Design a protein around this ligand. Structure first.
Ligand SMILES: CCCCCCCC/C=C/CCCCCCCC(=O)O[C@@H](COC(=O)CCCCCCCCCCCCCCC)COP(=O)([O-])OCC[N+](C)(C)C
Ligand SMILES: CCCCCCCC/C=C/CCCCCCCC(=O)O[C@@H](COC(=O)CCCCCCCCCCCCCCC)COP(=O)([O-])OCC[N+](C)(C)C
Ligand SMILES: CCCCCCCC(=O)OC[C@H](COP(=O)(O)O[C@@H]1[C@H](O)[C@H](O)[C@@H](OP(=O)(O)O)[C@H](OP(=O)(O)O)[C@H]1O)OC(=O)CCCCCCC
Ligand SMILES: CCCCCCCC(=O)OC[C@H](COP(=O)(O)O[C@@H]1[C@H](O)[C@H](O)[C@@H](OP(=O)(O)O)[C@H](OP(=O)(O)O)[C@H]1O)OC(=O)CCCCCCC
Ligand SMILES: *[C@@H]1O[C@H](CO)[C@@H](O[C@@H]2O[C@H](CO)[C@@H](O[C@@H]3O[C@H](CO)[C@@H](O)[C@H](O)[C@@H]3O)[C@H](O)[C@H]2NC(C)=O)[C@H](O)[C@H]1NC(C)=O
Ligand SMILES: *[C@@H]1O[C@H](CO)[C@@H](O[C@@H]2O[C@H](CO)[C@@H](O)[C@H](O)[C@H]2NC(C)=O)[C@H](O)[C@H]1NC(C)=O
Ligand SMILES: *[C@@H]1O[C@H](CO)[C@@H](O)[C@H](O)[C@H]1NC(C)=O
Ligand SMILES: *[C@@H]1O[C@H](CO)[C@@H](O)[C@H](O)[C@H]1NC(C)=O
Lengths: 326, 331, 116, 336, 209, 105, 328
């Protein structure tokens, strides 16, 4: 074991972690993998999403050329802070954590030809721009942009290690999504232009689709019943004024409190989603049952035509609304 | 003195010690015996889909470098020598947030056995993640695990095993979650493979059975007794319209409200639970009862007593049959 | 690990008597010194308690004033005084150090005072 | 300089001082004298079944290596030296998240006297767990414990003791009470030996006896549900021809009892058993439901008409039965 | 190594990071510049708003003078703790955090004459006064003040670059209620109990929709 | 302070059978009692500390039992050299004592 | 030149600086003068029973080891020398959670003066505990403090005093509390005695006085208008039942909602507050009005209600006189 002690000492006797490999010679290529162990929950209110990755990096360093009895050295993390690592940050991350139990969670293997493999376990609260115009039928493309911070394109460029499809592999069992389902991922490599130089940025967009199952049974189907609770009153007596009364004074307030409840748990944006439009037209459907009652109290044949036209007029709107989105 | 003898023994042990290299680097893997004493399971949140577990995670391995042949004592050094020795790279794979309690010092111990055995315990609170099947909720039986794995060392370098088989996990019987109930626990040693090697894996699992007495007090019995309220409209005369209207549409409102109030206490799952099935049906009855009164009014003002005396008991039973079907399906 | 006291005393009632016990083999500052009264063919009754590190003496609520306990530093010894002794003060006294779990580990050898 | 004497004393103390070893390792047992000064007993979280406590947790052991002969007897220093010396590894057995404060510097006290006695206190915020049984909630009394012992050192290595009398070794401060629900009745300490996987350890226990107050609960759950039974009891005095009015009585009071039943079961553990408050809610709901069944019965028999025998009997029967139940209950628990 | 290593070891040869460059020579003129990434949700209840920037500073430390073929010394965050960094803090920042994953997000470039560019990524929950009159049709100007903590106006002086305040896409921002109308910069002197300090303020004009 | 009412004052059996002492505390003393024996012309000697802890030099027949309030001392197969008075103490507060218990043949 | 001199100087000073021993370790207590500049007092809390305070805490004492003569300026040292110099062990007794802000460096300051005065200023955001007697709530006035104490050094190792004495604390007047109003602030110096010794203590205390303006428009005036609406049933004819019954019950239910709607956002205090007593009195009046209609329909099966249009506004106005003369 004393042989590998002096081998690791001769690799560190003169190493400078402040300098990239080949600083004045060529460009340091870094091969990157992402292994999504658990795509976590997506917060609509914060427009952030959680993701647990196994961030792997791979680059060539000629300064760590070793010839000994081993071909690969799976060392611990306490030789990682004194070797040059890339300065990779996440451009659209808000607050993300590197786990620390029972040691800090990083991997480091030095291949005999100076190649390094640097795997580190993360949990990323990255930003996701969300357009809430097709809520809750909406589909999203939440990205994960990462690139160098202090190294421009002239010295550091990243690359994907394997093919463009076999790099953002997702674990099959691990999926902590309770609202969405993961359709697929698309990969792209870009060049950004900041005020300090040119940097490489790679994007990994995760395609998401919102399951309607929660919102059809929380907010939609009560907003249907409400108005067919509002279809009882045409079938009542013309003289029964205090009854249809209670019938109506309640249907409106339940449309209002479900308008606020559907507006709960979503960003306070200035635009209207495709949830309030179903509510407001149904609110105009509930309010129209009040106007006919004010008409018949002012004066039946008006009651009979409202028993037929209006349940079909709502049965036209659902056939229109549930055909252009779904 | 014995003090200076132990001092020079530790000075001899930690001189030339390479913390970067595991024991038996060029030889076989090191066997790491691991036993857990669960201090207490704090709680199980279905909203955050996790559970919190305090434990006394202990690891036993053998280092040939830490062997002393003079003093016949188990040298229990301070917890500050743990950062000067090699420890395994053990990480829990489904934890969301975990810490080692650090009052009044760091809660860990280093017991040096004179042969070379190292015992290394820690008091760790892990908020380990646990995906749940909330379809039978609240009459469900979940299964929450704790995956323990090495991060950087493969099966060619570290191998894991429970110390003493099923006698490696103790104290789980005295645990007392306030809502669940530990039925059984099992210990599994598997060998998972990733893209950098195949790693050892120890998984400790629990089977939690939920108690329904809290849900009997909160969400079942008010639903049942608003339902038993709604059938007094079948005894009230038809001509008193306002009373029957108020009864039917009020029972209905409460049914929704309650169904709105309890669904926000659970996450946004897209499927249907057992409690949602009950309240979905409970709505039907109160909605129907109201439509039965509406049909009685339409028949009179368009025998009302005969259909009233029918549904004056039909619902009670149809409801008892639905209750028997629901309970015999899920119990 | 031995408690050595003085001899017996023969004093008239209404006087003052000086009585003391010396501990050897250990320092008295870390432990607590106690005092107890054993009247013949009855139970034990505690007199008072000191500690040489701090010095705040404290006594039985039926023994203050008439009895005080003092100590010093160099001679490793605990002294006491009685004031206006009576017929019921005829007893034998022991001093006890504090042991594990406050047990009154090592006791004295006995100093019986008699009045006349 | 004159201060150079006091830094040639300290460098003489920490010279060859192996801080990984307890004092008197292969010779004796480290008797650690302990006491607690509770500056503020914090609020008790019922829902988490835990409590918060601010302390000046003190320790006092004996080190023979820290022996000096200087101008001063006591050598009051800052915390730096506390990291350079052996301190005991006292952890809290039932603690969940304790904060060793450090504003503005680290809140630690270190006092080495001449002979070698040490005193080393610290300001902590122990968020200890307290197993609570709530069968008589909210007229229940708990003994919330506080157990601390050494982590690594067994009974043959480190033992603990109280430095004063055990009745006076946990001193709660006079103005320190952040408790809103409870009031601290008294103190209780004990010393014992616990058995674990690695060996036997000396464990120190501190029981805090808390009795819960019902004043808030009277305002929130009891008196709303006492008035609600009286509110539905008004319906017995109306006509037999006031069917919509008495249905409004029955529906509104049953809804009130239902929302107070749901709203009573909040900020509380989801316990399987039914508390003492639940057996008041159930009987109040039974009374208002019996009032509604009484109205349905008198409505089915209603056809000028005459005063009801059922109503006239209910006007006497219901308040006496409610008074008997209230007397029995508020003597079963309150005067337990 | 060989050249850049001996350049860096020639630079910090006893370089005290405790004494600002020129402690009794002249006021250290600091050229600041800012690139706003995204302005977060304006928390109206707490009267605060979140802003993500790239805080740039450009002072002229002379001891960092090197004569070689290499002109500029692009470096990482390792060198940041070794040299004198000014103690700029945000005066109305309720709380702030630099980002650390996977490396401390800092930049340090040293030109051969002595310019020390130093940028870092910050997320600042700066405190904004919000008047509740004319609710909800009210306009606002949320500030972002920053100055030194210990070094007074006689010791370091701050300065703005003509186009210092830089704004990005203005479409992926989390401004749901408000809309970014415009920006402005102001430089004044504050009088505190320790002396005079130069305060640089950035005002963000927001109008509710 | 704390009143000890250990019973009985005197009780007698023969050599070689079980004997059970008892001591009752007026208030809470939590496992802090102490049992002492009083040989004639001899100072008290510590026998059991805590509630049930055999002191060094104490034979195995001396066994005590403990609780919050009531405490019992049991000797299996007593003999002639154990013919002495027995005292019950406490240390949870300022120390008090009981009456004592005589043993006879 | 200068930067050449400043160095050898600040290298001599710290060389041989033993952070362990305090200034005058074996001499008189260290005179520490304290300045606080309040930056913002924000969340005064009643559920948690504490207030958030942001301040520029600043201490001033004298160390003779840090004396320079060659330089006539002021050694404004970087913020990382504080781990190398001695600073006092000042803590806050009623603290719960506090920190020094760490952007872009640790927010602290050291300025060595030419005699040996050490200027130590730090940016601290603290959450100090403040128990509140909300018995007159909301017409109450609370006295929230901040107990500044030394921990390890006794009255023979540190003496605390206010540098400005009375102005030692500025910026309180420019603190606008979202829903309170700071009336008076005091500076108290004293000595506290524990079992380990006697320690000096400063305490900064504010006298918060709540504004009932918001409270009077959503807890008092809705409760008044509901009780006014209860008396409309007196003018309705007994001949009808359902209108008076529905009005009285909606009045009862609104009163129960508004009294069990506010105490959720308050600590579970076991006592009764002023708003709670006022809403209890309103509930009593409402319940007595409803028991009046039972009385009428029951007495019949025009004078009982006629007395009620006069008596009920008189006693309720008489109740408002007694209530607003006590809690004022
Ligand atoms: C308050 C109590 C009320 C109780 C009432 C009880 C009785 C009523 C209750 C009845 C049914 C309720 C239970 C089922 C609900 C869940 C369905 C579901 O999840 O399926 C799908 C969502 O759902 C849809 O896609 C819905 C489609 C539109 C329905 C709109 C209402 C009806 C239209 C006419 C309305 C007006 C008619 C009248 C006009 C006058 C799931 O989609 P997914 O997520 O893509 O699938 C999984 C994807 N995966 C394979 C990757 C995993
Ligand atoms: C929703 C609106 C309703 C308004 C209603 C109208 C206004 C009504 C007026 C309200 C104001 C008066 C109450 C204010 C609260 C403080 C008092 C209190 O609770 O004290 C204590 C209760 O002590 C007991 O013993 C409990 C008694 C319960 C009595 C229940 C009613 C009578 C029972 C028969 C009912 C049926 C009778 C009829 C049957 C036909 C609480 O104790 P503590 O303080 O926590 O601690 C102990 C005290 N200590 C500190 C001194 C040790
Ligand atoms: C939202 C609706 C808005 C409607 C706005 C317009 C509403 C509008 O103009 O109503 C007038 C009238 C109301 O009729 P309604 O049935 O309500 O009134 C009866 C009607 O007038 C009979 O003729 C009367 O009998 P008689 O001969 O006196 O003995 C009877 O009195 P009596 O028998 O009790 O003595 C009345 O109660 O309706 C129409 O003419 C057709 C409505 C077509 C409605 C639209 C069709 C497309
Ligand atoms: C939840 C309680 C359920 C109790 C169910 C109790 C069910 C039960 O047994 O009811 C019978 C009777 C109904 O009395 P009630 O006065 O309601 O009914 C009268 C009765 O029907 C007479 O026979 C009628 O006279 P008539 O001959 O037609 O001319 C009279 O009408 P009229 O004179 O106006 O013409 C009716 O009003 O009630 C009792 O005797 C008191 C029982 C008190 C029982 C205890 C009640 C607490
Ligand atoms: C808020 O509460 C605090 C704490 O009760 C009040 O402080 C108290 O103020 C009085 C008057 O300044 C102090 O009394 C004075 O004490 C000194 C000795 O220290 C004595 O020389 C004076 O003659 C006078 O008696 C009192 O000590 C002090 N409280 C404590 C516990 O020290 C404060 O006034 C209250 N109000 C405000 C506006 O802060
Ligand atoms: C630097 O130290 C000098 C020492 O004299 C300070 O001098 C101050 O002078 C002003 C103007 O007369 C007085 O108001 C102050 O009270 C003096 N301070 C003292 C005597 O301590 C000077 O203010 C210091 N300045 C800095 C930048 O620290
Ligand atoms: C040392 O530890 C081993 C393992 O538990 C145990 O068998 C042995 O008795 C211990 N030796 C001593 C002297 O404590
Ligand atoms: C503020 O910005 C302008 C350009 O937008 C620049 O000219 C000016 O110098 C900056 N600050 C000031 C007022 O000096």
């Amino acid at each position: 074991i004393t042989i590998f002690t002096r081998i690791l000492d001769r690799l560190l006797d003169g190493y400078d972690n402040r300098l990239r490999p080949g600083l004045g010679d060529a460009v340091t290529e870094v091969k990157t993998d992402i292994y999504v162990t658990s795509f976590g929950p997506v917060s609509d209110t914060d427009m952030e999403y959680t993701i647990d990755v196994f961030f792997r990096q791979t680059w060539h360093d000629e300064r760590l050329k070793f010839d000994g009895p081993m071909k690969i050295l799976p060392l611990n993390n306490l030789l990682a802070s004194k070797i040059w690592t890339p300065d990779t940050f996440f451009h659209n991350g808000k607050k993300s954590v590197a786990h620390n139990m029972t040691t800090p969670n990083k991997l480091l293997r030095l291949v005999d030809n100076g190649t390094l493999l640097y795997t580190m376990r993360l949990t990323i609260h990255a930003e996701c721009p969300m357009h809430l115009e097709d809520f809750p039928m909406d589909v999203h493309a939440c990205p994960l942009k990462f690139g160098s911070y202090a190294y421009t394109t002239a010295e550091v460029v990243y690359s994907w290690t394997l093919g463009k499809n076999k790099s953002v592999e997702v674990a099959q069992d691990g999926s902590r999504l309770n609202q969405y389902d993961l359709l697929g991922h698309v990969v792209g490599t870009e060049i950004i232009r900041s005020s300090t130089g040119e940097y490489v940025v790679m994007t990994t967009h995760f395609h998401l689709k919102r399951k309607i199952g929660y919102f059809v049974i929380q907010t939609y189907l009560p907003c249907i019943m409400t108005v067919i609770l509002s279809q009882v009153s045409f079938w009542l007596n013309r003289e029964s004024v205090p009854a249809r009364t209670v019938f109506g004074v309640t249907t409106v307030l339940t449309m209002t409190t479900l308008s606020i409840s559907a507006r709960n748990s979503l960003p306070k944006v200035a635009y209207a989603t495709a949830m309030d439009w179903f509510i407001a037209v149904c609110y105009a459907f509930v309010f129209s049952a009040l106007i006919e009652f004010a008409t018949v109290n002012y004066f039946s044949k008006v009651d009979k035509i409202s028993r037929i036209i209006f349940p079909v007029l709502f049965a036209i709107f659902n056939l229109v609304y549930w055909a252009t989105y779904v | 003195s014995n003090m200076s003898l132990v001092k020079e023994t530790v000075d001899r042990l930690l001189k030339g010690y390479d913390i970067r290299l595991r024991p038996d680097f060029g030889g076989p893997p090191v066997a790491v015996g691991m036993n857990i004493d669960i201090a207490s399971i704090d709680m199980v949140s279905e909203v955050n889909m996790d559970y919190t577990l305090t434990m006394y995670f202990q690891q036993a391995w053998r280092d040939k470098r830490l062997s002393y042949n003079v003093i016949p004592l188990n040298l229990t050094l301070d917890n500050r020598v743990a950062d000067q020795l090699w420890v395994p790279d053990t990480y829990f794979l489904n934890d969301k947030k975990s810490f080692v309690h650090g009052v009044t010092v760091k809660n860990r111990m280093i017991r040096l056995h004179p042969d070379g055995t190292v015992l290394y315990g820690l008091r760790i609170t892990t908020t380990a993640a646990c995906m749940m099947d909330l379809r039978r909720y609240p009459l469900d039986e979940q299964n929450c695990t704790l995956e323990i794995e090495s991060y950087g060392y493969t099966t060619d370098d570290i191998e894991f095993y429970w110390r003493g088989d099923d006698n490696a996990v103790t104290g789980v019987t005295k645990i007392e979650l306030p809502q669940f109930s530990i039925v059984d626990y099992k210990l599994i040693t598997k060998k998972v493979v990733f893209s950098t090697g195949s790693y050892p894996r120890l998984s400790l699992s629990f089977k939690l059975k939920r108690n329904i007495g809290y849900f009997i007090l909160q969400t079942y019995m008010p639903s049942i007794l608003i339902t038993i309220l709604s059938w007094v409209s079948f005894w009230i005369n038809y001509d008193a319209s306002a009373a029957r209207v108020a009864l039917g549409i009020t029972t209905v409102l409460t049914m929704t409200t309650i169904n709105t109030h309890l669904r926000e206490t659970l996450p946004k799952i897209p499927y249907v639970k057992a409690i949602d099935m009950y309240l979905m049906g409970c709505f039907v009855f109160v909605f129907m009862a109201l439509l039965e009164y509406a049909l009685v009014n339409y028949i009179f003002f368009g025998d009302v007593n005969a259909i009233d005396r029918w549904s004056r008991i039909f619902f009670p039973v149809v409801f008892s049959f639905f209750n028997i079907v629901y309970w015999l399906y899920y119990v | 690990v031995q408690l050595q006291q003085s001899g017996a005393e023969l004093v008239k009632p209404g006087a003052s008597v000086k009585l003391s016990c010396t501990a050897s083999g250990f320092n008295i500052k870390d432990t607590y010194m106690y005092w107890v009264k054993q009247r013949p063919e009855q139970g034990l009754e505690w007199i008072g308690r000191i500690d040489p590190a701090n010095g705040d003496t404290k006594y039985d609520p039926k023994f203050q004033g008439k009895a005080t306990i003092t100590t010093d530093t160099f001679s490793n010894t605990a002294y006491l005084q009685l004031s206006s002794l009576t017929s019921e003060d005829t007893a034998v006294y022991y001093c006890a150090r504090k042991g594990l779990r406050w047990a009154m580990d090592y006791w004295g050898q006995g100093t019986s005072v008699t009045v006349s | 300089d004159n201060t150079t004497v006091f830094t040639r004393i300290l460098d003489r103390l920490l010279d060859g001082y192996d801080n990984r070893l307890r004092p008197g390792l292969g010779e004796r047992v480290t008797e650690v004298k302990t006491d607690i000064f509770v500056t503020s007993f914090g609020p008790v979280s019922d829902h988490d079944m835990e409590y918060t406590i601010d302390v000046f947790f003190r320790q006092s052991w004996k080190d023979e290596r820290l022996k000096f002969k200087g101008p001063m007897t006591v050598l009051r220093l800052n915390n730096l030296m506390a990291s350079k010396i052996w301190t005991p590894d006292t952890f809290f057995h039932n603690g969940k998240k304790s904060v060793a404060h450090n504003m503005t510097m680290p809140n630690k006290l270190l006092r080495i006297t001449e002979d070698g006695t040490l005193l080393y206190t610290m300001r902590l915020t122990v968020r200890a767990e307290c197993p609570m049984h709530l069968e008589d909630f909210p007229m229940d009394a708990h003994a919330c414990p506080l157990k601390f012992g050494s982590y690594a050192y067994t009974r043959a290595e480190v033992v603990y003791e109280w430095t004063r009398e055990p009745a006076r070794s946990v001193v709660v401060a006079e103005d320190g009470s952040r408790l809103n629900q409870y009031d601290l009745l008294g103190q209780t300490v004990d010393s014992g030996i616990v058995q674990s996987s690695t060996g036997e350890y000396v464990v120190m226990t501190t029981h805090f006896h808390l009795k819960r107050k019902i004043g808030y609960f009277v305002i929130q759950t009891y008196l709303p549900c006492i008035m609600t039974v009286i509110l539905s009891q008004v319906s017995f005095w109306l006509n037999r021809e006031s069917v919509p009015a008495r249905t409004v009585f029955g529906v509104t009071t049953v809804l009130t009892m239902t929302t107070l039943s749901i709203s009573a079961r909040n900020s509380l553990p989801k316990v399987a058993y039914a508390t003492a408050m639940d057996w008041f809610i159930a009987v109040c709901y039974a009374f208002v439901f019996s009032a509604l069944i009484e109205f349905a019965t008198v409505n089915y028999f209603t056809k000028f008409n005459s005063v009801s025998k059922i109503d006239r009997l209910s006007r006497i029967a219901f308040p006496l039965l409610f008074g008997i139940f209230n007397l029995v209950y508020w003597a079963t628990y309150l005067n337990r | 190594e060989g050249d850049v290593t001996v350049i860096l070891n020639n630079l910090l040869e006893g370089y005290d990071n405790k004494l600002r460059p020129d402690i009794g020579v002249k006021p250290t003129l600091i050229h600041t510049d800012m690139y706003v990434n995204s302005i977060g949700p304006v928390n109206a209840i707490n009267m605060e708003y979140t802003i993500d920037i790239f805080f740039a500073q450009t002072w002229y430390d002379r001891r960092l003078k090197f004569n070689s073929t290499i002109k500029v010394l692009r470096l990482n965050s390792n060198m940041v703790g070794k040299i004198w960094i000014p103690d700029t803090f945000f005066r109305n920042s309720k709380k702030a955090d630099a980002h650390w994953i996977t490396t401390p997000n800092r930049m340090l470039r040293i030109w051969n004459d002595g310019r020390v560019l130093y940028t870092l990524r910050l997320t600042i929950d700066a405190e904004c006064q919000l008047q509740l009159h004319n609710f909800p049709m009210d306009e606002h100007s949320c500030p972002l003040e920053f100055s030194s903590y210990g070094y007074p106006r006689e010791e370091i002086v701050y300065q703005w670059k003509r186009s210092s305040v830089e704004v990005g896409d203005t479409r992926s921002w989390r401004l749901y209620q408000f809309s970014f109308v415009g920006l402005r910069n102001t430089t004044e002197v504050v009088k505190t109990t320790s002396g005079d300090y130069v305060v640089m303020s950035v005002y963000f004009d927001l109008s509710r929709r | 302070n704390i009143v000890m009412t250990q019973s009985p004052k005197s009780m007698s059996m023969s050599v070689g059978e079980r004997v059970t002492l008892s001591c009752k505390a007026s208030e809470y003393v939590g496992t802090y009692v102490s049992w002492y024996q009083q040989k004639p012309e001899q100072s008290p000697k510590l026998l059991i500390y805590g509630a049930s802890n055999r002191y060094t030099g104490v034979p195995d027949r001396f066994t005590g039992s403990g609780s919050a309030t009531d405490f019992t001392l049991t000797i299996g197969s007593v003999q002639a050299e154990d013919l002495a008075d027995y005292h019950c103490g406490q240390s949870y507060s300022y120390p008090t004592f009981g009456a004592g218990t005589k043993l006879e043949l």
